[PDB]
Ligand SMILES: Cc1cc(OCCN2CCOCC2)nn1-c1ccc2ccccc2c1
Ligand SMILES: Cc1cc(OCCN2CCOCC2)nn1-c1ccc2ccccc2c1
Ligand SMILES: Cc1cc(OCCN2CCOCC2)nn1-c1ccc2ccccc2c1
Ligand SMILES: [Au+]
Ligand SMILES: [Au+]
Ligand SMILES: [Au+]
Ligand SMILES: [Au+]
């Protein structure tokens with residue numbers, strides 16, 4: 152039973168950490184909320200999406216100081232995943248939550264990704280075709296609408312040029328990155344984009360850790 | 367000098383013994399379905415709502431071929447990510463040599479058709495089907511009622527529109543084809559639940575065919 | 583610190599080879615130039631792109647004998663990369679330069695690929711949507727226009743049915759093929775297309791080697 156030691160240790164660790172992370176998520180005080188981010192995005196779903204980004208970042212830094220990256224640590228990073236290609240501006244990211252501005256200037260679409268996190272996107276501009284699993288028809292969502300991609304759900308997404316949205320995700324964030332960079336690894340091979348993503352995520356993690364240390 | 371190389375010689379011997387075995391089996395096997403049969407059955411219902419067409423096609427298939435089409439309890443729409451496109455399938459029948467399914471997409475997708483060891487026929491029930499054959503510079507658009515025969519060893523570029531639905535029948539060595547149907551699910555989407563669903567429906571169809579053979 | 587010798591040697595080798603190849607490319611005598619290919623392509627920017635292909639191949643074989651493959655060694659090879667799919671006709675290829683006719687008859691788009699080479703594409707027909715990195719808006723280019731995808735640059739590309747262009751790339755060509763075949767490896771699994779690409783590249787390399795040997 153010596154060769155079973157590795158497998159038993161792996162099973163024990165994975166189930167001890169499933170239980171640990173699941174109890175942590177059910178007893179942790181979160182910074183942001185899905186209704187909060189969706190409401191803030193709906194407040195500005197009218198004007199030019201750039202002005203919406205500006206006002207949303209201003210209100211976020213006012214209402215949650217020390218939790219949004221500084222303008223020095225902001226950059227649009229490409230995101231290739233599930234067969235679609237867009238760009239993101241990460242405003243906040245922790246081990247359990249993340250907030251970003253996502254969108255595309257080209258017509259793309261693919262797999263939404265099935266991960267251990269609840270994600271909410273409020274469309275600021277463009278169109279969002281969603282095709283839920285097990286169906287034969289898709290629905291199109293317009294600026295002002297908010298789509299909640301639940302945990303374990305998998306849909307087909309499609310966007311139009313100029314489609315932009317504010318996105319908030321809550322769950323176990325690392326387990327999701329495996330999907331967000333798969334195409335960057337096996338399709339685009341844009342390792343510099345991978346580096347940019349890791350860089351901005353590390354900056355958000357260090358910002359959150361510094362804010363925790365100050366308190 | 368044959369110790370290093372023993373693995374390579376065993377691999378070559380096995381691959382050629384199994385190419386011979388499989389190609390002799392495919393040339394001496396009585397098949398269940400036919401390309402023209404499925405094409406006619408699909409074209410007969412190409413004018414109705416593709417959902418109603420699906421219903422009537424499943425009924426006629428279970429009527430004319432009892433014991434070879436899955437029961438309604440074992441049917442479910444499984445996402446399919448492959449060649450850069452994304453659609454969904456409903457597997458009606460599948461063995462080691464044949465498969466019948468209802469394929470289509472509710473979003474605008476397109477990519478590589480996939481080159482495999484099987485002849486595949488698709489009859490469009492609704493939507494549009496852009497096909498771009500290899501070595502050409504122009505593409506053709508196929509409409510409901512048309513039937514496309516993707517021959518063995520052929521590779522094309524496919525593109526679909528929202529609401530494109532079709533009945534598809536493939537004949538050949540089915541396992542060697544699944545490698546293409548799940549590549550994006552492995553390296554791009556990582557939707558392992560969809561991988562499990564695919565293995566599930568294929569195993570269910572294989573067990574149904576094995577049970578029908580055992581009863582006979 | 584004995585096993586740090588391997589890592590230090592690896593870094594030293596990679597930087598000595600970076601310096602070697604980069605100095606070579608900065609001092610090498612090239613056969614073609616981007617303005618030459620771009621002007622020749624713009625002269626024939628029309629609707630009947632096929633006649634443009636024929637006349638361009640004729641002019642290339644006239645002004646540079648022994649550097650363009652013969653009609654026997656020409657074939658349209660599928661190209662899957664970055665999430666898009668097109669087809670190519672390789673006219674010339676070496677270790678530092680390559681000239682081809684690229685295009686698609688279907689609607690595709692994805693990652694342009696970030697490689698160690700400057701690439702120039704002159705659109706003969708169709709439309710070319712380019713989305714530059716770090717921006718939120720995309721530009722649309724039409725037949726006659728020439729786009730220079732610079733070294734280290736990464737953009738999002740999108741094409742329409744019937745989009746065809748003449749492309750010339752200069753740099754370290756092998757390091758680019760890794761991107762050009764990634765989707766063929768992990769997405770399409772079209773090993774025959776991989777063989778065709780390797781075959782036409784080998785034919786071009788042997789043609790250029792024969793021309794060097796004759797001189
Ligand atoms: C986990 C993840 C999924 C994803 O997909 C694009 C967003 N939306 C998904 C659903 O609906 C359409 C668009 N991006 N992303 C990500 C990527 C990079 C990240 C970096 C730091 C923190 C979170 C980070 C999170
Ligand atoms: C082998 C294969 C190719 C494919 O591609 C989508 C269909 N068409 C292809 C050509 O034209 C456009 C659409 N699905 N598929 C498959 C996927 C899962 C399967 C599961 C069980 C049995 C056969 C199974 C077969
Ligand atoms: C390196 C590379 C990139 C590429 O991408 C498509 C062209 N364009 C790129 C930028 O803008 C849009 C379209 N093809 N390709 C290639 C593929 C095969 C090759 C074979 C031999 C020599 C060079 C060879 C070069
Ligand atoms: Au930004
Ligand atoms: Au931003
Ligand atoms: Au079904
Ligand atoms: Au069905």
Ligand SMILES: [Au+]
Pocket residue numbers: 656657658670671672
């Ligand atoms: Au050619």
Ligand SMILES: [Au+]
Pocket residue numbers: 635656671683
């Ligand atoms: Au050609």
